[model samples]
Target: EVETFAFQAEIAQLMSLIINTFYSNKEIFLRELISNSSDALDKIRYESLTDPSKLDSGKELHINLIPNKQDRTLTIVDTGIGMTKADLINNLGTIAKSGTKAFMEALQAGADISMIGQFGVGFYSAYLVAEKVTVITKHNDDEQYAWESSAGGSFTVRTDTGEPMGRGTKVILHLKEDQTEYLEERRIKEIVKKHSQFIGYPITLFVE
Candidate 1:
């Protein structure tokens, strides 16, 4: 079912702040994404404790990183929380438009927002370097949806068929020429170590 909720009058201002700020470092794009993946891995592990069936010994909870020199593509796959259609819009679209509002509300309400992070719009950071981005997610409870976008104001959401990802999500980024710096193996390694080494979950880099 489709639903709609209107934003407050300050939405325009919120969008402004969202587009202008939030991420302290653009390069931390990789950090933000990997961090999210790590959280997902941890979440699944916790779920497994009570529901042993959710645990897949073969599907190690490591984040999979793949780089294709030929396509200048980088794919980050995780066996973490998957998304539904509504999640797509709310996570990447709506949040981008209301992040500042949420921030301001937290500020004015005297709430300590120190640990708050961009839970939604963070995914859009892929556009900082990718000419195109593809998110393939398999839901254990619902249908799988692949969201493809060029960050050109619209994204396509389509149903796809493939072996269901035992339990997780994967995002593939097609690099823009100027963003090729992320393609270098050394650069990727440094990024992983610098930002994600301390994460509680496992991460791996491959040449897939």
Candidate 2:
């Protein structure tokens, strides 16, 4: 069954600020996403040290980037700590802890707002370049679920009945017309090298 939810009023306002005026350089979206993935991977790995059944005692860990030019999509998959349906709602559906009210006030006052560190809101940066975003994720304790949003003040969650990922999260970005540069392998490699190559996990780009 598919379930839909509305964003909190503050969340909708914060998203508008982020989408319309937050980031000056759109390429930062990739870096932010990769950073979040690394953090999640680290968390799961740490948990596995104490709880051997977290995912696997020792699994090959990596992030994969697969692009589909024909579909205008770029899929980023990570063998990391995947979110449960409730986690999705708690994390993405609210920006309350991101200092959203302060950020909004600053924007309204025509003051400079440098908010990169004020919150863990970087995941929402996908809206900087994507027309739609889909996340399919699985956690050891929960069934697989899919979350979809175009950031139009609402998002939907549904049980994913397809093949299971076993563990981890997959983020699919439906690129905007002006953001097509992200679909090019050359550009992606350059960006990854510049931004995320130093990340501890192996990062792979699926190339044709």
Candidate 3:
């Protein structure tokens, strides 16, 4: 199972910078998550050659946006290769990817910062204008898992006990007061077409 990793100060600060300051367009965050979902679909599709069952779950890969104006919330969900507990800790909580170190080193060496796009858990980007976040995911290899965080350096992961989301992952973003642009259907659609129309999988917007 995946376990959380506490950052080494500078790393935490760096994460804070990216989440809070580096990104001005709050909408591009959705693009990162969509790209990741498309990549996951591409991977499983490749794997389906040997075992068709591998592609059985979440076959209709898509990205969806759920808006809650009353709660002042915006949620983005993806029906693709979902993650498990280990993944939550390893992928979401830690900079466990090999490239982070190399990217940082490169950043220090005057390498083009614009060339890198390592925003795996673009889920974290929600912290930019969110008071809380709920991430629910289902992996082909394991059961559904939920993770919750509020940008306060604390998060919790638990086994899924509710009705199965069937297949795929969902991120419920509780939007903060100053960032309500995400609630509009037009806004979501505009961003999706602009940055995600080139996506390999289908995507939809949800109003709930």
**lDDT of all the models against the reference?**
0.66, 0.79, 0.67
Runs in model 1 lying further than 4 Å from the true structure: 1-25, 56-59, 92-97, 100-120
Report the Cα lDDT for candidate 2: 0.79
Clashing pairs in 3: 2-86
Instruction: Report clash pairs, candidate 1.
Output: none
| lDDT per residue as tens, model 3, 56-163 | 674666677778899887777777667767877565534534455665676678753332455233445566667787888888888888887665455668887867
Instruction: Give the Å error, residue 10, model 1.
Output: 10
Query: Please, what is the TM-score per model?
Result: 0.75, 0.88, 0.80
Worst 10 residues of 2 by lDDT: 111-120
The CA lDDT at 39 in model 3 is 68
Error of 1 at 54 (Å): 2.3
Q: Supply every candidate's count of residue pairs whose N, Cα or C atoms clash at under 3 angstroms.
A: 0, 0, 1
lDDT of 2 by residue, 17-107 (tens): 7678745577777887888788879988898889878866237677999889999998888888888779887754335655566656665
**Which of the two candidates, 2 or 3, achieves a greater lDDT against the reference?**
2
Q: Comparing candidate 1 with candidate 3, which one achieves the higher lDDT?
A: 3
